[PDB]
Design a protein around this ligand. Sequence first.
Ligand SMILES: O=P(O)(O)Oc1cc[n+]([C@@H]2O[C@H](COP(=O)(O)OP(=O)(O)OP(=O)(O)O)[C@@H](O)[C@H]2O)c(O)n1
Ligand SMILES: O=P(O)(O)Oc1cc[n+]([C@@H]2O[C@H](COP(=O)(O)OP(=O)(O)OP(=O)(O)O)[C@@H](O)[C@H]2O)c(O)n1
Ligand SMILES: O=P(O)(O)Oc1cc[n+]([C@@H]2O[C@H](COP(=O)(O)OP(=O)(O)OP(=O)(O)O)[C@@H](O)[C@H]2O)c(O)n1
Ligand SMILES: Nc1nc2c(ncn2[C@@H]2O[C@H](COP(=O)(O)OP(=O)(O)OP(=O)(O)O)[C@@H](O)[C@H]2O)c(=O)[nH]1
Ligand SMILES: Nc1nc2c(ncn2[C@@H]2O[C@H](COP(=O)(O)OP(=O)(O)OP(=O)(O)O)[C@@H](O)[C@H]2O)c(=O)[nH]1
Ligand SMILES: Nc1nc2c(ncn2[C@@H]2O[C@H](COP(=O)(O)OP(=O)(O)OP(=O)(O)O)[C@@H](O)[C@H]2O)c(=O)[nH]1
Ligand SMILES: Nc1ncnc2c1ncn2[C@@H]1O[C@H](COP(=O)(O)OP(=O)(O)O)[C@@H](O)[C@H]1O
Ligand SMILES: Nc1ncnc2c1ncn2[C@@H]1O[C@H](COP(=O)(O)OP(=O)(O)O)[C@@H](O)[C@H]1O
Ligand SMILES: Nc1ncnc2c1ncn2[C@@H]1O[C@H](COP(=O)(O)OP(=O)(O)O)[C@@H](O)[C@H]1O
Ligand SMILES: [Mg+2]
Ligand SMILES: [Mg+2]
Ligand SMILES: [Mg+2]
Ligand SMILES: [Mg+2]
Ligand SMILES: [Mg+2]
Ligand SMILES: [Mg+2]
Ligand SMILES: [Mg+2]
Ligand SMILES: [Mg+2]
Ligand SMILES: [Mg+2]
Lengths: 556, 556, 556
Amino acid sequence: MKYILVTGGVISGVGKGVIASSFGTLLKSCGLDVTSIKIDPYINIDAGTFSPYEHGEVYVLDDGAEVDLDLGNYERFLDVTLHRDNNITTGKIYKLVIEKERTGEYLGKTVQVVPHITDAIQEWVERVAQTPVQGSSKPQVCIVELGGTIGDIEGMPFVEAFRQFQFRVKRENFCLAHVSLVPLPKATGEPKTKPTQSSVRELRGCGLSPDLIVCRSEKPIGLEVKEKISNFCHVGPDQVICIHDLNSIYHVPLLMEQNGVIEYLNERLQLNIDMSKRTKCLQQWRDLARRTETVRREVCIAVVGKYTKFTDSYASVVKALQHAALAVNRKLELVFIESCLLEEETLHSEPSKYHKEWQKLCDSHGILVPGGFGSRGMEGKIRACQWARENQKPLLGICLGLQAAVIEFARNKLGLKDANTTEIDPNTANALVIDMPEHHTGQLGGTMRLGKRITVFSDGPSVIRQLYGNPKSVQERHRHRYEVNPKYVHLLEEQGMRFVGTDVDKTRMEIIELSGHPYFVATQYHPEYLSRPLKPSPPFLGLILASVDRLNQYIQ
Amino acid sequence: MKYILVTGGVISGVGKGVIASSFGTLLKSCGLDVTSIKIDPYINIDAGTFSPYEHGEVYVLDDGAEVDLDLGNYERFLDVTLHRDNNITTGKIYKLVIEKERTGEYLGKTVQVVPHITDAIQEWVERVAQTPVQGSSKPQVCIVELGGTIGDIEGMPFVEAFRQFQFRVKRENFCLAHVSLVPLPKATGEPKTKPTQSSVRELRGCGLSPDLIVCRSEKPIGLEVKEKISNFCHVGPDQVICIHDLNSIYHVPLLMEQNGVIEYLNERLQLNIDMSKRTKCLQQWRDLARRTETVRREVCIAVVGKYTKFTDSYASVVKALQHAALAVNRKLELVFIESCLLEEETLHSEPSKYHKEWQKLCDSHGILVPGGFGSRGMEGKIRACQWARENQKPLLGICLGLQAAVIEFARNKLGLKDANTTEIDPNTANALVIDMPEHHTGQLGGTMRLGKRITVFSDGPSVIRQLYGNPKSVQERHRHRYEVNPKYVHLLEEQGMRFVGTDVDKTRMEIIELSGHPYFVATQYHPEYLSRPLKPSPPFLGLILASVDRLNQYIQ
Amino acid sequence: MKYILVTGGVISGVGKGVIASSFGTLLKSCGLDVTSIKIDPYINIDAGTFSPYEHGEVYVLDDGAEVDLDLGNYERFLDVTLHRDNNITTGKIYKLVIEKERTGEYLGKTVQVVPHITDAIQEWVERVAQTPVQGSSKPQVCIVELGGTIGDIEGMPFVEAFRQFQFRVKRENFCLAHVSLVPLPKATGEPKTKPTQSSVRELRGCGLSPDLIVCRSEKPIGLEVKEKISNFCHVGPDQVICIHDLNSIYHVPLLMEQNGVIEYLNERLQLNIDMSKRTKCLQQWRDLARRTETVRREVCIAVVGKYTKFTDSYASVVKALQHAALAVNRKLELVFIESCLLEEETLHSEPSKYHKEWQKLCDSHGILVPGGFGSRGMEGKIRACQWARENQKPLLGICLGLQAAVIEFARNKLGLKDANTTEIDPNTANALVIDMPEHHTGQLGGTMRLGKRITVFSDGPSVIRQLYGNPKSVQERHRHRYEVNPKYVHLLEEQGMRFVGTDVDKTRMEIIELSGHPYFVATQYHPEYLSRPLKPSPPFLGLILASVDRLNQYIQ
Ligand SMILES: O=P(O)(O)Oc1cc[n+]([C@@H]2O[C@H](COP(=O)(O)OP(=O)(O)OP(=O)(O)O)[C@@H](O)[C@H]2O)c(O)n1
Ligand SMILES: O=P(O)(O)Oc1cc[n+]([C@@H]2O[C@H](COP(=O)(O)OP(=O)(O)OP(=O)(O)O)[C@@H](O)[C@H]2O)c(O)n1
Ligand SMILES: O=P(O)(O)Oc1cc[n+]([C@@H]2O[C@H](COP(=O)(O)OP(=O)(O)OP(=O)(O)O)[C@@H](O)[C@H]2O)c(O)n1
Ligand SMILES: Nc1nc2c(ncn2[C@@H]2O[C@H](COP(=O)(O)OP(=O)(O)OP(=O)(O)O)[C@@H](O)[C@H]2O)c(=O)[nH]1
Ligand SMILES: Nc1nc2c(ncn2[C@@H]2O[C@H](COP(=O)(O)OP(=O)(O)OP(=O)(O)O)[C@@H](O)[C@H]2O)c(=O)[nH]1
Ligand SMILES: Nc1nc2c(ncn2[C@@H]2O[C@H](COP(=O)(O)OP(=O)(O)OP(=O)(O)O)[C@@H](O)[C@H]2O)c(=O)[nH]1
Ligand SMILES: Nc1ncnc2c1ncn2[C@@H]1O[C@H](COP(=O)(O)OP(=O)(O)O)[C@@H](O)[C@H]1O
Ligand SMILES: Nc1ncnc2c1ncn2[C@@H]1O[C@H](COP(=O)(O)OP(=O)(O)O)[C@@H](O)[C@H]1O
Ligand SMILES: Nc1ncnc2c1ncn2[C@@H]1O[C@H](COP(=O)(O)OP(=O)(O)O)[C@@H](O)[C@H]1O
Ligand SMILES: [Mg+2]
Ligand SMILES: [Mg+2]
Ligand SMILES: [Mg+2]
Ligand SMILES: [Mg+2]
Ligand SMILES: [Mg+2]
Ligand SMILES: [Mg+2]
Ligand SMILES: [Mg+2]
Ligand SMILES: [Mg+2]
Ligand SMILES: [Mg+2]
């Protein structure tokens, strides 16, 4: 078994996941089976209790585990399906060890970080690396990504573990890549190398030595900076890969092939790759990266959300849209609108912002309402759906735009002024959105409707079903705690609202459609999780098509 | 005695010197005498062997010590005159200690870093802090600036020293300020706080605790980032000063007064300042910062140099020009031209660059040629002077534009094709620039004509003498190793070249003038070192005036 | 070239030098040429300014360099002659680097610890390792001993240096041995392993990994402690050598051969030793270690000194005596007497101590007076010589017993009551001991009569000359600053004092003899430095023989 460890330097958000996915796709293009593991030193059994501000848009697997977006990137790049054990954390490790100790599996011995925590980590990695991930394929290489920055207090065990692992698995099966930021401050006037030097020093102060150093910068750096890094960090100049900021990440693997990473990995890990064969390996990524540069059509979409100050809180969503616009041969122009500025309280405190955001909203071609939690920014998310309804503008809603749209429809058609959520006001007369008491145990954490569930469309042709290929079923990933009230269902169904989808037992609503309206589709699940570069997601596809008035043509 | 220590975080070039100078000028405006010390952990007795790429434009004091530009900033802000002992280095400390040990001043004892190196450091600081610096004034506060980043291997002694010093001088006389970078990477999408956290951790791992944290960013940061820093670095929110990138540094002290640094320092160090008195303290800096924003005249100057890829290699020069253009009520527009692109070798390899740089040079209003060393970029520095001569364009030359201009005049008027330098070709027939053998001992380091020397103008009114106030003498700082050949003097003097200045013995040329030409002045010394915000330097003044055709009017 | 680095753990004085010498003699017995280097991180160009309390009895080489006793051990074990460059220190390194920088050998660059100090260290080691040391032999292995404990602030450069060196010289030519203390506190009740664990952690935190761990204990440790060390320090159980406290150090190499160090070093460094040949390699050390256990004769010697609270302040001396008593087939019984207790001031403050020490002195068979400095304990060192003179007891004096004896003879025979030293009273009427003004420059350090000088005996057979083999000359190592007054020479020579030796110019006294007395020999030089296990030193030989009444028999 072969292992590639990807560590980090100065900051989080430096680009470790993209580098790991690029290594994976390079190796997979040359005829190797690859698996991936993500280590997150935070004390959390999963990322289900995080805000999107913390680490960017919780991702959900099929089994239902909330994880970091790096696993989403792995899935999108390598076309794999990962599990809950591909995400190691300090919380899990300590819980497992404490359980084993309270059982008596080390009776007589003092349980310490070394050897026990590190042993557990190595056993977990060994175990999961051998596990097939794209069928029953036998993985030959594992890419492990160590989260955070070297030097964090939380990740000292893991480092130690791997310092042992490299001697447990025979250096010629282990390689390390350190991703470090090279900043260029405007007032300083030059790219700075000292943070990378200090990070490599901290790394070597734990028994590990880099085999590759990946320098991340906004712009490309000269050979002088490369030489400085090679000399003050003690690696060869051929072992310094400089990956700058690019338009799309599809360019990253190519830029790696252009720098000889395949040859170095075949020489260092002894992969025995026949290279007269390997040409045209990355033709997929070449085609994608090119097509991403030749499209000039400028479809403009609005994203009305409450985390819009940190765009990475909608990563999946964004990428989904891209994967659609590129298959339609269009160029995406994304507009982020903060929901609280669509509310009337801003018209009495800051009218300029109000009118500017409403201008942005009205001069677009399509609206996407993402999911969320809480009560901050939903009463403008309501008005967005209301406007798109009363002005015939395409619309896709995702797990909270559905509920917002239902409440809006109620309050604007059925004269139900108090139609509201339990998450906002639980003591409301007309509760259109109610609590699912199976997932309201008080124990927050794992207590969500999570993972892939089955879809069943009601009878009667539906545009959204035709976009799905007219099947009887489809599996989709859910992540939610509330649910639309089934009681009021027909009170909306006897109007321009139609439930074209629900669960297998026909009492939990998960899709809705507006007749007469070009495109007003909403999904309680997240269709953003199964979109891929060469396999877009039908709802986003239809949204884009409607936004360019090509939906009926594509249907026929 | 009171002490303010200024430490650094993530990178060098973060802004410690400006912060120290701002503290100094704030305290000095409220009626306190201030001195300054700079500690540079590099193993060098002085910065005379550095390239400008390394640490930005060696500065020279009156005594003749080559030092960092932070001392230039101290001098410009506080109006002081500093000495060779205001610059401590590891080399000096180790040399002194080794000498004392080889004498027998610790006979019987093992000489170690602790206690001996740290003791030496503390004794030096104690000694120099009490030394009058603006006369025989008794200093009441010393600002010590520790160079480099906390964590560097070279600065561990110093840190330790100060950890002891704070108990030697009674916490209520000691305060620490940590200047740290807060980066905002484009692809990350948020200001990052982890480097500051790690720097403060490294600092606390040496026994020191910050009393102020100065966060440096390109743009202002919100209260959320401030709260994160205050919580994860364990200081009060009132102790987090956020200094972003500004147009001029004159704004820095004001921005400090706006954040309550004076009150905090009066409460923490017990300065006993009467504040009903202190209003209008910073009126000078307010006037300067304002006038720097109200000037719309756009005088455009060219700087033809060989270090133009790192602008801080001409800091003093730049500032000098500014101090002039603001007193003339003009706005400066600086153009940096690389000299090698003015040479014909680039016309046969990259003609576009050649013609673009020549365009930049020809569409300006004045030319400044700075100093330099070596042979890379002088044959275009020659052509710049030649063009300005044959096209009647104002010109100021500084310590190598003088020699370049002399060689150009020779080769273009006296038909001396081989007129060249010894620094380029020492075996040339016509050597216009020769070696001063008193400063050519082979021992490079301190072996330069350095420091303030006396000027004497030859008889005959000179515009450059009228700009100096028509005195008989003036003291100016020199830093050089070569000198124009006195033999060829009259062969140039019997033409449009005139030596309006030389030393007291009348055999070392230091100024030259071209008759008929509006302004073609050159100085072998550096007039950039004594320019001040409210006391510009006459040569730059005349350059600007000639560049706006206001020189004759100002003369009368 | 092959390198064996010997590092230290918990304390200094743990036994690194003995281990290094043992490695050397093992490799040399199997047909390999070995050289040795000692690195001392203290800031001292040599140990000539140390007290014996600091690091145990300054040793002197032939060239005249004052060094640590580990070099004495190297010389005694391997039969080599070392030079001033076999002793590296931080002071030397920093002086050399600062000189090179003030010359201009890194012009343009900032001089830092990394790379410059570490480079200097590696260049020095490379250079000296190739230098022949026992003729023009070509060394094949170098044993480098890093002084102090891993973790000391002074030795961080060196560690870093070697972390690079191991990759510069190809791991298969580099091996590391870590010597660590394993204490057994009486009240704790078990051998403790945590200090060794922490030392190995600190070592690995600098990029180095042990190839051998040598555990030092007073008594042997069980296999449980060995297993704990092997597991918590991550080496193989065959790589844990346990060297306990032994009667003689001759047993150390044998105990190493008994644990398979030769085979491990031949496998790890690829020495290609033919082992069917190597049997009987350590027969010399076997014979010595045995004979050191079979001798039952109990010759009892007194050592009257002023550093007697730390016995290692006379190491060489002690060993010299041993090397003699074993060749005479006697067992040595050493008594250490503090000189200040022989003085009358103790008879009025602590008479019991006075009388006890005088009892110890009077119930012995021979007296040895060692060298010293200062004035603390010389007026009892005078009385010891006086007693041995007036009671016919053999006596050897070393570089201060000579001066003490001369002063005693003066004050007790020539009625010169004020006969004294300049080191005690420089303003004395009768100055028997005067200052050599060639070595009194004020600059203490290197300003001593040092190194090997030539001996010439005056004409007239002398017992001490017959013990030397009746030659005309002999080279001996000196270390001193004062000298007996040549003026008073004949005033003592016209009595029972006779100068049987002096320099080549016949005006500097270096030996003296008392006629009628069995053995009263004194040497201004140190004959302790050239004594070897199988080549004793004639003065100590004669002292022992006289102490067993076998001197005249051995003469004939
Ligand atoms: O400017 P000051 O006021 O802080 O004064 C300064 C700045 C820097 N230094 C020392 O020079 C070496 C390299 O410095 P340096 O930060 O530039 O590292 P580097 O290798 O060049 O990487 P990088 O590209 O990031 O710059 C280090 O030993 C520093 O301790 C000193 O003594 N005083
Ligand atoms: O993204 P990955 O792939 O590296 O995965 C990551 C990223 C970060 N973390 C952990 O979360 C905490 C704060 O992280 P964090 O870097 O953001 O520090 P902070 O306090 O928030 O300051 P800052 O503003 O600079 O962000 C730390 O304990 C980290 O070790 C983990 O476990 N996996
Ligand atoms: O007794 P207290 O009052 O201090 O309470 C103590 C003593 C020791 N410990 C922990 O047990 C482990 C091994 O301890 P330990 O010192 O014995 O190391 P080791 O591996 O066994 O080597 P060694 O032979 O030197 O003993 C360590 O993780 C200690 O932190 C604790 O928690 N409380
Ligand atoms: N043997 C045993 N030990 C227990 C049990 N429950 C708790 N312990 C603890 O676990 C320790 C076991 O460590 P061991 O090193 O095997 O000592 P031991 O139990 O006496 O076993 P021996 O050393 O073979 O005699 C005991 O000392 C107990 O203090 C139990 O049910 N059986
Ligand atoms: N006294 C003395 N010591 C010297 C001289 N030159 C080098 N040394 C060394 O410096 C050391 C002085 O340390 P001290 O602790 O004072 O020991 P001491 O010199 O014997 O002085 P006392 O302890 O008072 O007897 C000596 O041991 C010498 O090894 C010298 O000229 N005079
Ligand atoms: N060239 C030169 N530099 C000196 C001399 N004395 C001190 N220096 C300093 O050492 C530095 C040399 O560094 P370099 O990187 O070679 O810069 P340079 O001297 O301009 O040489 P080039 O980069 O080739 O133009 C100069 O910038 C000076 O500041 C000298 O006599 N000659
Ligand atoms: N080379 C690159 N060019 C542009 N954006 C990049 C690049 N590498 C990474 N990114 C983006 O930067 C963000 C952070 O990357 P990520 O993989 O999450 O890093 P980490 O795991 O260190 O937090 C993501 O939005 C990612 O798409
Ligand atoms: N607040 C600021 N805004 C703009 N430029 C700044 C600011 N502070 C410092 N600078 C500039 O940044 C550079 C580095 O500052 P300097 O005082 O040399 O810092 P340090 O001592 O850390 O290297 C200088 O050119 C300085 O004028
Ligand atoms: N195995 C041993 N048994 C007995 N004494 C020893 C042993 N090893 C070393 N010693 C003695 O301990 C002292 C310290 O050893 P030394 O070689 O000076 O160590 P280091 O270089 O660590 O200070 C010396 O007197 C030495 O003879
Ligand atoms: Mg991240
Ligand atoms: Mg964060
Ligand atoms: Mg909330
Ligand atoms: Mg700087
Ligand atoms: Mg630098
Ligand atoms: Mg040069
Ligand atoms: Mg020792
Ligand atoms: Mg000691
Ligand atoms: Mg003394």
